[model samples]
Target: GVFTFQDEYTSTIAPAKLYKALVTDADIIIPKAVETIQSVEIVEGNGGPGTIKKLTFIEGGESKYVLHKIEAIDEANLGYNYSIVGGVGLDTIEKISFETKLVEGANGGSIGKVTIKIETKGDAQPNEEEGKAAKARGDAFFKAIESYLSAHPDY
Candidate 1:
């Protein structure tokens, strides 16, 4: 079975600015805001579609890794898509992927929208609470980066 979720958030920074950080400087900024993410390393490719990024999570004093393959990167639209190919969170799910787009906010600054798709193994299902938690975690991570950008205008 396939499950999909969509979420939206607003940021003070422009879409292009946040896109630059996510696509280009995530390795440098993500770990700073999300304490759980110890580090992100590019195992293959050069920050483009087809690149695989390994993210190490250091939470509860234990370390775990998740490998994701970039599926699409639209520079003009400031959008990105990636799929989780392997790692700690795939035991029950057959596949998982995410698509994110940054656009100008109606009020001001930028609006970020994220769509998550999950394909579960036979008879298996994802818990709604866990899914929401995961989305919240991602939101917090980006919010932290937004805070960083606010402090450092140069970046």
Candidate 2:
């Protein structure tokens, strides 16, 4: 089975700044800004398409990791697409991919959209709270980074 999800959000940060922070130097800025993320390492490839990054997270006194591969990046337009090719905690799920786009908002801020597509093994369905938890994490991630960049405007 396959399912798709969409989330749209807004932030006061400009799209150019948001995109540069999110896709460009995420490996460095994320771990530094977000407390839950232990680290993110570039396992293979370069910064462009096909690059693979392994992110380690700490929660409840335990650590887990996930691997993400870069699919495409539109630096000029603030668009990025990537896939969770490995390290998903769910065995029933096969693959999960995400497409993110950031556009300039009306007030010099940013409007962001995230599209998620998931594939399940056999006839399995995802957990009911999977999406909820995913969104929570994302919200926290954005808030964390936004705070980081706010403090360091030169970022």
Candidate 3:
């Protein structure tokens, strides 16, 4: 079975500014936003499409690492898609992919949206709670980044 989930968040930060932090500088900034994340090591390609990244978490953590492949990145649109090829979360789900987009919001802030698709293995049922948890985790991630950027204007 397959399930889809969407999450949206708005921040006072500019779309372009958040886009760069999420895509262009992800390798350097993501770990800082998520405390559990220790580092994001680029295993292949640059930071563009086809790039493979390994996200390593803190030692002794529930999830040690997750491998992902960048599928597409649209700089002009401030959107990108990536697949979680392997990881602690992939145990029951056959595959998982995330599509993220950042656009201008009504209040002059930017709206960030994410679509998550989960494919379950045979005879497996999609866990609604798990899906919601994933969305919540992403929401927390973006919020943390927004807060971080707000504090460090120079970055």
Candidate 4:
């Protein structure tokens, strides 16, 4: 299965609020989704282009890890893209790309477009299991942001 799927969702949070949490308050974001992620360490570049993020996910008594390098941050378009720099326990992965966008939503709400792409290394495309995992992680991240906003109230 050598294929790629794109997933996207819209959020009701404003662009300013969404962007601030993602870029500035990631320390808070990482904790909100502790169920899905153990830790996220900034390796370099401070959340901008060339930034490196290490993500650790523990499940079923096993631990998995992945690293991403920020490729671009388009402030004007409210978008950011990253490329998977490295990963462990997944031998069939070639690369992964992640992108997020903040656009105006209905009646002053904001729309968040999150995109993910995976390149198979050895003919190991995303199966149902992989797709489900991807979707679950994406949903969890979104929920974390929403939870943060809910608690902050004024941000």
Q: How close is candidate 2 to the true structure, as a TM-score?
A: 0.94
lDDT of 1 by residue, 1-155 (tens): 88888998898788888888887678887777566888999999988889999999975588899899999999898989999988763367888899999999856689989899999888789887878788788888888788878887785
Stretches off by above 4 angstroms in model 3 are 59-63
Q: Encode model 2's per-residue lDDT on 21-85: one tens digit a residue.
A: 88788888999999999899999997789999999998778888999999999998888999997
- Provide the global lDDT of candidate 1 against the true structure: 0.85
Across residues 1-155, which tens digit of lDDT does each residue of candidate 4 receive? 34556666567778877877775666556666446677788877767888888888776778888888989887777778888888775556666787888888866778777777777766666667877976887777777777767777674
Please tell me which predicted candidate would have the highest lDDT against the true structure: 2
lDDT of 4 at 19: 75
The lowest-lDDT stretch of 10 consecutive residues in candidate 4 is 1-10
What are the Cα lDDT values of the candidates? 0.85, 0.88, 0.84, 0.74
Candidates sorted on TM-score, descending: 2, 1, 3, 4
* lDDT, model 2, position 64: 88
Per-model C-alpha RMSD = 1.6, 1.4, 2.0, 2.5
**Against the hidden reference, what TM-scores do the models get?**
0.91, 0.94, 0.89, 0.82
Query: Tens digit of lDDT per residue, candidate 3, span 9-95?
Result: 999988999998888898888888778788999999977888899998864546588899999999999989999877653367788
What is candidate 4's local distance difference test score?
A: 0.74
Q: Give the C-alpha lDDT of model 2.
A: 0.88
